From a paper:
The triple mutation G41V + Y101F + R43S (in mP3) destroyed the binding of the α-COOH group in TaTT and led to the loss of both BCAT-like and R-TA-like activities. However, triple mutation improved the affinity to R-PEA more than 60 times. When Y101 was substituted for phenylalanine, the side chain of the latter oriented almost 180° away from the P-pocket in both variants and accepted the conformation induced by both the R43S and G41V changes. The former created a void for phenyl moiety, occupied in WT TaTT by the R43 side chain, while the latter expelled the F101 side chain into this void. Compared to WT TaTT, the mP3 O-pocket loop lacks some stabilizing hydrogen bonds—between the backbone oxygen of S115* and the side chains of T197 and S173 and between the backbone oxygen of F114* and the side chain of Q170. These disturbances induced a shift of the loop, and thereby, the side chain of F114* shifted toward the cofactor and partially blocked the entrance into the active site. In WT TaTT, F114* is located opposite F39 and forms the stacking interactions with W32*, while in mP3, the side chain of W32* occupies the WT position of F114*. The triple mutation in the P-pocket induced a significant shift of the loop accompanied by a rearrangement of hydrogen bonding between the O-pocket loop and the structural elements forming the P-pocket. Consequently, the α-ketoglutarate binding sites are disturbed in mP3. Moreover, the side chain of F114* is placed in a potential position of the γ-COOH group and can prevent proper binding of α-ketoglutarate.
Transaminases (TAs; aminotransferases; EC 2.6.1.) are pyridoxal-5’-phosphate (PLP)-dependent enzymes that catalyze the reversible stereoselective transfer of an amino group from an amino substrate to a keto acid or ketone, thereby producing a chiral amine or amino acid and a new keto compound. TaTT is distinguished by an expanded substrate specificity: it can catalyze the amino group transfer between BCAAs and α-ketoglutarate, producing α-keto acids and L-glutamate (benchmark reactions for BCATs), and between R-PEA and α-ketoglutarate producing ketone and L-glutamate (R-TA-like activity). The functional dimer of TaTT is close to the dimers of known BCATs; however, the P-pocket comprises only one site for the α-COOH group binding, and the O-pocket is enriched with hydrophobic residues, which disturb the alternation of hydrophobic and hydrophilic residues typical of BCATs. Generally, the active site is a combination of two pockets: the O-pocket on the phenolic side of the PLP and the P-pocket on the phosphate group side of the PLP.
Residue numbers in the entry:
A (entry chain A), B (entry chain A), C (entry chain A), D (entry chain A), E (entry chain A), F (entry chain A): 6 to 314
Write the structure that this text describes.
Amino acid sequence: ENPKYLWWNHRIIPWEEATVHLTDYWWASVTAVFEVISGYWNNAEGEMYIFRLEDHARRLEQSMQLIRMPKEFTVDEICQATIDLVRANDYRGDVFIMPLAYAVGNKAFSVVGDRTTEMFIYSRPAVSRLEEDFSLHACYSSWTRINERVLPPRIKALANYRNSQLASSEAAMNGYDTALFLNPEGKVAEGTGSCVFFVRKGKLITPDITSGILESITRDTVIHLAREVLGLEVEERVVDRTETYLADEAFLCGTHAEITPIASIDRHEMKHGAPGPITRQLRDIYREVVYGRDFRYRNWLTPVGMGVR
Amino acid sequence: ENPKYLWWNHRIIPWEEATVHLTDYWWASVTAVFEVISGYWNNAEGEMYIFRLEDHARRLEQSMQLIRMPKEFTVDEICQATIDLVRANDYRGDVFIMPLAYAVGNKAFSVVGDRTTEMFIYSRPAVSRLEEDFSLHACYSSWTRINERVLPPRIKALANYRNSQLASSEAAMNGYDTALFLNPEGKVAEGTGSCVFFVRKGKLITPDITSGILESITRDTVIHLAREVLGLEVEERVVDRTETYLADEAFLCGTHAEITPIASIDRHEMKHGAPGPITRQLRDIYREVVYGRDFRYRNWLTPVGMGVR
Amino acid sequence: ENPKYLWWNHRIIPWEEATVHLTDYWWASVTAVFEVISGYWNNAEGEMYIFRLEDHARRLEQSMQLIRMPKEFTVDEICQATIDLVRANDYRGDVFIMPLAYAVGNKAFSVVGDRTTEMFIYSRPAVSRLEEDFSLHACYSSWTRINERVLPPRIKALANYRNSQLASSEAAMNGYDTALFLNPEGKVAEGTGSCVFFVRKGKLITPDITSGILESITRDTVIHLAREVLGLEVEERVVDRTETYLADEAFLCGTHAEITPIASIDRHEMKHGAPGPITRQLRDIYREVVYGRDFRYRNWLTPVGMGVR
Amino acid sequence: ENPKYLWWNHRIIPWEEATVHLTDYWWASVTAVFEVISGYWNNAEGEMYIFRLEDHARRLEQSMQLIRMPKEFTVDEICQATIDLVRANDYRGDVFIMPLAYAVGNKAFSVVGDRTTEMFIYSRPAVSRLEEDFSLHACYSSWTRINERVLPPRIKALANYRNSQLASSEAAMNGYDTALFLNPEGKVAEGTGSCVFFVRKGKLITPDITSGILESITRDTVIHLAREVLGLEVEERVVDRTETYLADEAFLCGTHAEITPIASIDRHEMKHGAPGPITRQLRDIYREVVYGRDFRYRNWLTPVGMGVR
Amino acid sequence: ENPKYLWWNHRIIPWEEATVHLTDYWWASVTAVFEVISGYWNNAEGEMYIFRLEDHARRLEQSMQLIRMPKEFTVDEICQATIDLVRANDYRGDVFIMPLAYAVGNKAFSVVGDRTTEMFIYSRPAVSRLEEDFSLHACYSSWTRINERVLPPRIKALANYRNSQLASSEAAMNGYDTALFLNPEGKVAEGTGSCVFFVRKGKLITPDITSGILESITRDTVIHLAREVLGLEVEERVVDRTETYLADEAFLCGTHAEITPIASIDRHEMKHGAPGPITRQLRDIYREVVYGRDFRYRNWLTPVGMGVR
Amino acid sequence: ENPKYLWWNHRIIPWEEATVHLTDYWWASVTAVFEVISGYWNNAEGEMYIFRLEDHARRLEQSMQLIRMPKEFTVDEICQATIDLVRANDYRGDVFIMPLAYAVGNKAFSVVGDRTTEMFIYSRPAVSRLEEDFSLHACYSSWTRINERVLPPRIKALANYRNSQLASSEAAMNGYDTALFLNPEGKVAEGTGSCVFFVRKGKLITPDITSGILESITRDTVIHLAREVLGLEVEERVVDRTETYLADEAFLCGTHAEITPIASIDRHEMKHGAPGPITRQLRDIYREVVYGRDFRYRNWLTPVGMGVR
Ligand SMILES: *Cc1c(COP(=O)(O)O)cnc(C)c1O
Ligand SMILES: *Cc1c(COP(=O)(O)O)cnc(C)c1O
Ligand SMILES: *Cc1c(COP(=O)(O)O)cnc(C)c1O
Ligand SMILES: *Cc1c(COP(=O)(O)O)cnc(C)c1O
Ligand SMILES: *Cc1c(COP(=O)(O)O)cnc(C)c1O
Ligand SMILES: *Cc1c(COP(=O)(O)O)cnc(C)c1O
Ligand SMILES: [Cl-]
Ligand SMILES: [Cl-]
Ligand SMILES: [Cl-]
Ligand SMILES: [Cl-]
Ligand SMILES: [Cl-]
Ligand SMILES: [Cl-]
Ligand SMILES: [Cl-]
Ligand SMILES: [Cl-]
Ligand SMILES: [Cl-]
Ligand SMILES: [Cl-]
Ligand SMILES: [Cl-]
Ligand SMILES: [Cl-]
Ligand SMILES: [Cl-]
Ligand SMILES: [Cl-]
Ligand SMILES: [Cl-]
Ligand SMILES: [Cl-]
Ligand SMILES: [Cl-]
Ligand SMILES: [Cl-]
Ligand code: NA
Ligand code: NA
Ligand code: NA
Ligand code: NA
Ligand code: NA
Ligand code: NA
Ligand code: NA
Ligand code: NA
Ligand code: NA
Ligand code: NA
Ligand code: NA
Ligand code: NA
Ligand code: NA
Ligand code: NA
Ligand code: NA
Ligand code: NA
Ligand code: NA
Ligand code: NA
């Protein structure tokens, strides 16, 4: 049912002790920023591998800085709390860890910088799909993606998902599995919760970060693996909508989405299938990396030894 | 300390019974919409007057519809729950009532329409400033207001305040009391939490609703009282930034802000002071209306008889 | 099968004589502008009534002027050619008349002003739905409406329908009957082939012409009939997307669309149904006008006497 | 006078057999997409060389896919039909071949995907200017170029030329030979019918494809020849208006425009003349390629042997 | 040759005494704001009439406030200095008076608020064209008008004319007499130095002030005279480009431009000529007002008695 | 006090001879363009080094061409006049030289191309800060930077500083030392008078020129020295606002600003200080270059031998 423990404001406590009032933190949620961090269980080694833990903890500290939450936690403390909780929960399987930071005020509309900074971290069992061949049908939304002018997508804020839900609602009631966004200038931005890649003529193409997207750690991982293991050309550039309809392959990528193939966009089918050949190679490489079976990428992994069963 | 009771999912319960897990509803908060409703205590009558209760309950139902929360509550139930809670709390003074509606999912990123609709209402003591002459110094923010393209301001969503906090943070660290917004086209929109009025040459001027603002009930109340009691011309139109610097008077208005005078905007002083003469007349008229001493506007008030002490 | 005749370049000819080469006029079609004009057959009088013939002929002359087609035809000639063809075709039933003007060049990319101006007019049986209660489900498109910057919607050009087809394709493959457009600023513009009206709180609301819409003769007719026969308030203004979702009623209007009720927009249902009460009154008034049974609006009708069977 | 034959819907027929009704296909023209393909006659070899035939046929298939025309023709069929028609016409000189694809509906406003796909191909004598030194005076138009938001320039649609004609009309009545466009953001896009290059400080500069331009085969050819034969730096980037006024050289390029020098832009003269030195080298290289006298680029040519007179 | 006197920094001095260094005030000119005020000589009365002197002096004080020039001069002082200089110059004919205010700094880039405020006023003979029937041919520029985002057009700043000169240069080298501007959204704004009016179907139409135009005193005068003397409908609204091409009449208006008829716009001719009938009535009414022969508008005039020769 | 001489319209004259009327050139200032050129005095050599004199003179000639000032001066004449004036002034210390070109008309609003071109050059003692460690606190302005649509930033026009002063006024009254600008699309552009650099993860980042910035000679110098002397990666790209808040270092650069460290942006502190390590290396390299003690960059220097005291 529930995990054994969670971390809250510098301490690990039993789950059933973290009880709050219904009315606590609704205003704090407007400030809230989060990470999603993966743990992958290698039963042959008896070790959990936490993927790019310090990169996620540094992004959370940056998101907190841009919200203007007062300084209270460190990068090393968030990394250590993640290790400690995965160990103490004693769950030997794939997990998601979610730090969530929030600033709490004396008044509903006090400025963030006058608030108190708080954080919890919780870890729960996750289901990987990296050993499954599946694909989604996407649409481009009639809703526009937030930009730096109004709500910087660089900040991994809960509030940014209100714009996401406009698109994901539309996609589901219009017969699609997932939405892609255009930015205010009309250029391809990202999915509702992950970055998008395209494959055309043996090249990987992905929107550049100033297209108004979150600076994904999975996106970075995929560009590295595509260049260094497969020797592919990867272009980070402005991407137009109609060119994506002619993509040989396409996929979403994100800590939660892992590598998720796109079969079609607005009912234009990816010519080489889903997962396409290059997608399938990147999915297999990614999997072997995160489960600790690719020594070349060991510096991306934080092992937590727990015992081999 | 705490109110005696609150309302939750169709029931009134003692405050200390509304306990939840720390991890409950963070994802639901992305969906959340709310109202702020005023109760004004008339000790001479022993009655609380709840201001434009049905208008607030209908706006909440509209906000919920635009979020796409499944149907669960009615306008009449939200009006009745507000009356019941103000009575049962037995607090004989000015109050704020806040309904907050949220949709809760099986998964973090399930579409809103597959969720369950929930709501609470809580009522707490409020401090009116309608018998005080005070004023704020405003700036125009370097952050842009959300528009219909990305996050419709018509929806009174918690998430819309993330954009608000960009502006209110900037205002406070730059020596101002409050921020005003420009819309993406560069035209004057609203404050961070209330609508803005200007007075120039004996006329009231306010941004039209398609300038990208919340359709305020206080804004509506002020236009009615300005036209019907004072016989003023009121223009709802596109408003430019530099014209506001030459305003004779200016004020913010909102359920929480009541009528809040603006002394200056980007260090251009309102020529007729703050509160200016027309501002002061509207503030006095508003006060007499909401405290039940203006029979002409009785249809805006819901009395809750509680006993005269 | 085919009509008896058509009009071409100042002459009426038998249908089967208007034969051209497959390769003729493809480049001319880029220039082409058109009207759709209704004839309504009153069997009790033995008369066809052609609706607002001179207004349609003047709009065609304006469209031709803005294309910069050399002067060749007159308003009176287009009105007379329409009368003559409806008479000579000897078809005693409702019809559509379509003038189509085009400029033909010596070279593919010669400037319009160096071309020759040509025109045909043809008339075919039409099916009215004014005695039927039906409704469409609409979406807002993810494709943006053309504006004055790139392709003025005031010009009733064939080429403007390429932008229309982006929206109408999307609507049909996404489970809808019809698309509505947003303009580049994000404000409600028009349908793919007709103007849109909304009814809310007993008022009619329609986008103002500078929202980037064709200046519809049906739109003008509806505003006149709503004000003069029903005494309704009609606002021509900037209209936001989410406000339309809360419309009590909505309808499309156009020479071809007559008065077409909208039941829902992006799966938000019009609260008072489709056709709603005000829609149903305007549809009945419109019908009685165009079939010549409303003496008040006789100056909008051009009778063509043909014999009462 | 007329060519002997043309191709229509999978068949070659004598020209005078391709007769249609005046009223046929005006609505189909809104859907229509086309290619312009060059044949260059080498009298010393008795061979026509058709330039980048498969690239043009693949672009036509992509344009047809983005229109959503049902599948009916193949890339190989369009390549073969082009060869067959050039041979059967027995015209031993430079030619233009124009495929034109169109979708035909039961009703005026049926969705493209419910239509029937049709196509013709015709070939006519062309005049090359590759052995002539000439130049055009250009202006930047006051009309804006279509973008992906409203009418994707990637689609080689007849309708896109309505926006072209706004600019080319203005240029001719204002004393210029040709118009250049700015995109909605104000950046340099393309000519009315061809891409634009600039030369400054020995470098070639051209707008990147996401500046909102057609992905020209001549543009691709010029970048290849500039890099591979001349060893020039070529930048594909965002280009500003005023920087173009300081260009040492400039030229238009396109299947129809071949390589067309620009002497001046808004009455700012290209400092190194027109054709400038680098322009003149690219024009001479291009010519030798397309007439089959550059063995290095033979894979771009489809020979059609016809006999050496 | 030169006027006898000018006013400078609170004093009238002989012209030849106002000598400065070549290097003085170039940086101050970036700050500079001005008015153009008309004096009209009535030889029958021996009086100069200065038109709407206080309105011009109040606009100058507002422009100075928005620049943030320190307070140094008053509205009454600028009105009195104008009277005094017109009298002391002893020139009995039509004149232009130009106040020019500037802030002077210790350093090139010191902030305006740390500078010293200075002003001169000079008066010179002017030529009225109010007794002449003439007309200009206009174009719409390919250059965009400044908006509130970058350079508020409400401020009558010298620097705003750099944007004007982009348009007026283009107009003259392209064969036109004058340029009109579109705003960044593509809507009609103003001329390079005056506001624009259109006449269509017996109504006057002019861009609303938030279209991004200077709040002209001549514009205000024309709307008053059109409504009050002619009983015309005047619409201040958003105006589209192509609708202006169909105007029956059009004219520029401004203190310097008086009432200047427009014969054509982008080679679309105003149907009722130039000056058209309504234009000609407004020109005659304006003239009789400013020369002091319309008692109804006497409160707009400041007489300066000088002697009747 | 004053320099001995200045250059004016092809001649050197004693300072006190360059006297003009107060009313001369205010309209000419709208046209005016300028350069700021540095002279650095090396007392050990008895030589002034004028930095990138020909690059500055060529930019001035380009600015003059884009204004459309008639041809009157040459690049070589402006270079020679600068040398001559620095020599004749006999001032042995660091100097600023400012050429200022202006077009003078017969009438206030004559087109620039009908005017006369004039120019002066003056040289004055300057204070270098290259031997000082200092830093500025910056904000991003609520005012938008001019773009190519309205006032091309490529032109180094006095009028462009009116937009600058909106930002620099706001910065000073809001407690900051200096303002940075966002462009109309919301991307980082430049400072009020200089370009901006960022350092993050050992890389230099600066907005690309089409972000709407002046093509700075100091910017070019810094990119050259960073790549060639330090071996740093330098990215010229679109830059987002929030990424700049996370910069390790930042600095302004310009002929007047030399290399000016930024300690903070909107109260986000540059993590590695100000001047940071890479900033400090570039400042020291720049200094040694301009004072003639780096033989590698001698071709950037124009020596003027004056005698070693
Ligand atoms: C979190 C997130 C991503 C993916 O980031 P990773 O670091 O790869 O998990 C992409 N888009 C959005 C909107 C996100 O919130
Ligand atoms: C709630 C709110 C207002 C004021 O609305 P009332 O109905 O007058 O309380 C104004 N602006 C915003 C952004 C709001 O959230
Ligand atoms: C023709 C048309 C209409 C309707 O115009 P009527 O004069 O009412 O037929 C509306 N929208 C568009 C795009 C049209 O082409
Ligand atoms: C066809 C076309 C071009 C040139 O394309 P090529 O493949 O080089 O012929 C350029 N611009 C536009 C708008 C076009 O239609
Ligand atoms: C001064 C000016 C006008 C006209 O203003 P009046 O008060 O009528 O002289 C119009 N447009 C611009 C840009 C101006 O500078
Ligand atoms: C002059 C200037 C700069 C710096 O240019 P340098 O050639 O380095 O002096 C930067 N920004 C603006 C706006 C400028 O006017
Ligand atoms: Cl809270
Ligand atoms: Cl540990
Ligand atoms: Cl990499
Ligand atoms: Cl939840
Ligand atoms: Cl009750
Ligand atoms: Cl009212
Ligand atoms: Cl044709
Ligand atoms: Cl007749
Ligand atoms: Cl009406
Ligand atoms: Cl057809
Ligand atoms: Cl063959
Ligand atoms: Cl290449
Ligand atoms: Cl100065
Ligand atoms: Cl006096
Ligand atoms: Cl009036
Ligand atoms: Cl001058
Ligand atoms: Cl010398
Ligand atoms: Cl370099
Ligand atoms: Na701890
Ligand atoms: Na498809
Ligand atoms: Na490791
Ligand atoms: Na209940
Ligand atoms: Na002030
Ligand atoms: Na009541
Ligand atoms: Na005829
Ligand atoms: Na619904
Ligand atoms: Na009639
Ligand atoms: Na065949
Ligand atoms: Na020139
Ligand atoms: Na070949
Ligand atoms: Na005085
Ligand atoms: Na004309
Ligand atoms: Na008077
Ligand atoms: Na000289
Ligand atoms: Na800080
Ligand atoms: Na040198």
